[PDB]
């Protein structure tokens, strides 16, 4: 039956989401921190979307990567038509959800992906970081503190639940995030920030020797 | 069921990959060395892709040959739009994987092919050779030392594991590669190099009397 088929599809999607590297995103004093478990040096699961909007994903690389590209596309055209400060994390979070739902209903296989869109305030302004999680069906959830995506999310989510502290510095939030992620080695870690203090482009990767010194 | 069908497709692809001539690619002092077991004199399994990017394949000739052509196509147009030094082995390796995955999902029969994209540094620059292996599904793997494609890959991969030496000269790497490939005769061998010392076009075939003298 159709209902049975739908249930099977949901189970398949869940399985796909489960067998994947884990990513975390959490708010800290200077903005938002993305920490993903990533062995490759070329393939990335964290990306700039717009001036103050970042993006992390977990699942099947070609698909989440494809969404990455679609999201980049929409923001630039919108900004050109109206302006940079008009594109918000909210509008982008919304677009992905609608697209995902329609796509799943009309396509063959559902995207085994889990998305997190992050936004911080502009330069010289005060506002709390916003985290949204978009799931494979189109559901969207507003997160106040942190998002955990891919793999087994329960232990990481709980460890973060005990260790999280608002207004933690960059080093403390990095320790908390790596610790809860372990529930690792300097190599194979993809770390980036949405630094609210930057004048325009807030996204900034933290790689190599500096990262080693921090950890 | 669909899952069962997918498993059957994977098995079929594996069988196709298995019944084929073996190719090896390995890093040596002057760049990268391709050594394939090829009886025909007209049909080739090693090819120039761009100035410093080479290509080897194993499987069904018409298909791997077709990818060869598609890859050649993309690089020239890209270079004309931006420039020669902008096309990299990484971008090409990526394109094939995405295309293969989409193609397999929407087509009838999966491409019974296995690809290896190789890149060396430009003239007067220092950088390690990069080898990527792209499999029939779209998976891509970053190899530090050597790639073995087609046929029974275990014995050749192990023999190379014992014999490999970084910064081996051209003759030593040729002996190692032919020896591990045997795990043959002067005839029916397709040998080419990505010589890092050439000014622009790095790919260069090694055929006939010179090859005989070397071996």
């Amino acid at each position: 039956s159709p209902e049975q088929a739908m249930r099977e599809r949901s189970e398949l999607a869940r399985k796909g989401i489960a067998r994947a590297k884990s990513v975390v995103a959490l708010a800290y004093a200077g903005g938002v921190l993305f920490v993903a478990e990533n062995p490759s040096r070329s393939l990335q699961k964290i990306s700039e979307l717009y001036d103050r909007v970042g993006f992390a994903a977990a699942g099947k690389f070609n698909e989440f990567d494809n969404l990455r590209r679609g999201g980049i596309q929409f923001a630039d055209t919108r900004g050109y038509a109206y302006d940079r400060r008009d594109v918000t994390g909210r509008q982008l979070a919304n677009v992905y959800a609608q697209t995902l739902g329609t796509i799943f209903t009309e396509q063959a296989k559902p995207y085994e992906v889990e998305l997190c869109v992050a936004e911080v305030a502009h330069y010289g302004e005060t506002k709390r970081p916003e985290l949204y999680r978009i799931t494979y069906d189109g559901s969207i959830a507003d997160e106040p503190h942190f998002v955990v995506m891919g793999g087994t999310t329960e232990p990481i989510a709980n460890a973060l639940k005990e260790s999280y502290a608002e207004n933690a510095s960059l080093t403390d939030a990095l320790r908390i995030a790596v610790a809860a992620l372990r529930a690792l080695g300097v190599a194979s870690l993809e770390v980036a920030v949405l630094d609210a203090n930057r004048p325009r482009r807030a996204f900034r990767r933290i790689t190599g020797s500096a990262l080693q010194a921090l950890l | 069921s669909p899952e069962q069908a997918m498993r059957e497709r994977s098995e079929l692809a594996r069988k196709g990959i298995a019944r084929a001539k073996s190719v090896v690619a390995l890093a040596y002092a002057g760049g990268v060395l391709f050594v394939a077991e090829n009886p025909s004199r007209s049909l080739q399994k090693i090819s120039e892709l761009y100035d410093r990017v080479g290509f080897a394949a194993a499987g069904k000739f018409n298909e791997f040959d077709n990818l060869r052509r598609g890859g050649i196509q993309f690089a020239d147009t890209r270079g004309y739009a931006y420039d020669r030094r902008d096309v990299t082995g990484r971008q090409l390796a990526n394109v094939y994987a995405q295309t293969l995955g989409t193609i397999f999902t929407e087509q009838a029969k999966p491409y019974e092919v296995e690809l290896c994209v190789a890149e060396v540094a430009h003239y007067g620059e220092t950088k390690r050779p990069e080898l990527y292996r792209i499999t029939y599904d779209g998976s891509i793997a970053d190899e530090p030392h050597f790639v073995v494609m087609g046929g029974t890959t275990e014995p050749i991969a192990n023999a190379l594991k014992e014999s490999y030496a970084e910064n081996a000269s051209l003759t030593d790497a040729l002996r190692i590669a032919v020896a591990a490939l045997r795990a043959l005769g002067v005839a029916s061998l397709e040998v080419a190099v990505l010589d890092a010392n050439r000014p622009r076009r790095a790919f260069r075939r090694i055929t006939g009397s010179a090859l005989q003298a070397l071996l």
Binding site: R19, K21, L43, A58, F61 | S139
Partner: peptide, 4 residues
């Protein structure tokens, strides 16, 4: 393959 290459799940991530």
């Amino acid at each position: 393959g290459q799940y991530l």
